[PDB]
């Protein structure tokens, strides 16, 4: 109804009381086109604090039940108040767990140097120029063949282990939205026994 729809709603998305109402109006009073609005809108708030400083936070970890794989992860926020919040906590636990399974190589894309990306990017067009279509066609062929690569090696671009429907970055952005503090993944560590 009124604050009852908004309530039950924000209650779930943990967002801005006014931003909630705004979205219900903004997209008729139906939850589905609202929560999805909120999600979509949240993505923006994220990019706004994207360059804010964050040296607070904690060290997340995940130790597989069989002790054969362990992961360390530095998750920074702005204030230690946030760091202590159940949401930060869980996000961290969940990120560590994800890494354990997905085994990313980098945190973000920019983390990748040129000479490196290139020594690779060409091995891409090398085999494309063969199986038919020459360079021009194979240059745009190796345009989406990279997107896949990043979804594999880059933590942020990886499909979240508890919902292959959303990319890691998104999971993060979502958090940032409900908190209001820039959240960054400083670095991670992963050991797999005999590997």
């Amino acid at each position: 109804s009124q604050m009852e729809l908004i309530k039950k709603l924000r209650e779930a998305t943990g967002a801005g009381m006014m931003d909630v109402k705004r979205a219900l109006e903004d997209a008729g009073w139906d939850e589905e086109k609202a929560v999805q609005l909120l999600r979509e809108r949240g993505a923006m708030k994220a990019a706004k604090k994207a360059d804010r400083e964050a040296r607070e936070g904690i060290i997340g970890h995940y130790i597989h039940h069989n002790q054969r794989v362990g992961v360390l992860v530095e998750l920074n926020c702005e204030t230690d108040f946030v760091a202590r919040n159940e949401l930060f906590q869980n996000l961290a636990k969940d990120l560590a767990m994800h890494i354990a399974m997905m085994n990313p190589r980098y945190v973000s894309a920019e983390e990748i140097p040129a000479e490196e990306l290139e020594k690779e990017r060409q091995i891409y067009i090398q085999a494309a120029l063969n199986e038919g279509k020459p360079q021009q066609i194979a240059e745009k062929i190796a345009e989406g063949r990279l997107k896949k690569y990043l979804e594999e090696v880059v933590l942020l671009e990886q499909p979240f282990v508890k919902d292959d429907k959303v990319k890691v970055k998104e999971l993060i952005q979502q958090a940032i939205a409900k908190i209001g503090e820039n959240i960054v993944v400083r670095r991670f560590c992963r050991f797999e026994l005999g590997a």
């Binding site: 967002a15 801005g16 009381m17 006014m18 230690d80 108040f81 409900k178 908190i179």
Partner: protein, 373 residues
């Protein structure tokens, strides 16, 4: 005119910083950390700031901070933030006397039902942590606009501007709701002994600065600390700078002789205070902060069993640390809570600050949080 310490906690993007500035400019037109100051008709205020749970908690121990009350800044447009739970949590921990609320950015919300709601949220949230969520005053306004107005008219006053009147509603709420500190000299007597000697024919005499309470002659007192038993006698004279005094009060560098007290029966470290007031103990709980290596603290960490020095006023007694479950090792810079046991009994009370050292070098410092044995 009374003085009080107040601090601001809450999300920064909610304007707690802006609100602080508005409070200064607003009272300026009525009354001629890196803290700021401002005063109403009733009292004088100094503003504390809580950016870190730890950061602050640290200082609350090193005697620095001492919030007599605090203001919670939440944007009415967003409503509470998840961390809001953590903000309040801190207050409960350090035990802030009372809290007052200010729903900022109220100008950015059309429907006034939401406001009632937002407030509903907060109110309950505090209830969850023992605070009188219902009894607490909740002011609605806009720090920004209130400030912009003071910028245009530095002399603006009560009743003139709409947003400034809301800031006042707040200043008022503080004066009221907020209990005013309980003065010192009003508290039971107590003085830490520094030196002790005699003045032939006069008796045994002990010097020291009174910490709290008052004291004349003929007053009955107790000598707590170090000794196997708490001896008690009566004052036989008072004297400041060696020139008889009517009454000695908190903050007075004095000296006192006692009846039925040998020279060997009292010494530095010991303490004398209102009988029955405080008792001697050996086992207690406390919140501490270990100095980082740079601050000259330890070079490495330590575990349960550590046996150092705890400077309690004038003394420096020995005791053993007992790291609690969950805490396995402690390193320089850490904030902790562990139990302790000392070799000799000492006059202990919750709130009592102290220091730790390894051969004169201070390595840590904490405060007592609970008495055990």
């Amino acid at each position: 005119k009374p003085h009080v310490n107040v601090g601001t906690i809450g999300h920064v993007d909610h304007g707690k910083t802006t609100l602080t500035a508005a409070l200064t400019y607003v009272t300026a037109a009525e009354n001629p950390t890196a803290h700021v100051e401002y005063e109403t008709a009733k009292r004088h205020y100094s503003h504390v700031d809580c950016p870190g749970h730890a950061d602050y908690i640290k200082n609350m121990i090193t005697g620095a901070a001492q919030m007599d009350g605090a203001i919670l800044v939440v944007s009415a447009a967003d409503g509470p933030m998840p961390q809001t739970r953590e903000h309040i949590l801190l207050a409960r921990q350090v035990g802030v006397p009372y809290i007052v609320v200010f729903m900022n950015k109220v100008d950015m919300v059309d429907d006034p039902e939401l406001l009632d709601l937002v407030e509903m949220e907060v109110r309950d949230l505090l209830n969850q942590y023992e605070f009188p969520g219902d009894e607490v005053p909740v002011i609605r306004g806009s720090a920004l606009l209130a400030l912009e107005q003071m910028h245009r008219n530095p002399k603006t006053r009560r009743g003139e501007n709409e947003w400034v009147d809301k800031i006042w509603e707040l200043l008022d709420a503080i004066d009221e709701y907020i209990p005013t500190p309980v003065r010192d000299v009003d508290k039971p007597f107590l003085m830490p002994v520094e030196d002790v000697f005699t003045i032939t024919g006069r008796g045994t005499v002990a010097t020291g600065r009174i910490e709290r309470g008052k004291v004349k002659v003929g007053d009955e007192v107790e000598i707590v600390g170090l000794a196997p038993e708490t001896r008690r006698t009566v004052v036989t004279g008072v004297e400041m700078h060696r020139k008889t005094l009517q009454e000695g009060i908190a903050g007075d560098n004095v000296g006192v002789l006692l009846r039925g007290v040998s020279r060997e029966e009292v010494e530095r470290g010991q303490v004398l205070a209102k009988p029955g007031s405080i008792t001697p103990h050996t086992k207690f709980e406390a919140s501490v902060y270990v100095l980082k290596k740079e601050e000259g603290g330890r070079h490495t960490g330590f575990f349960s069993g550590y046996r150092p020095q705890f400077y309690f006023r004038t003394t420096d007694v020995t005791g053993v640390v007992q790291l609690p479950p969950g805490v396995e090792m402690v390193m320089p810079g850490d904030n902790v809570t562990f139990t302790v046991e000392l070799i000799k009994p000492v006059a202990l009370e919750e709130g009592l600050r102290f220091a730790i050292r390894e051969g004169g070098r201070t390595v840590g410092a904490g405060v007592v949080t609970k008495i055990l044995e």
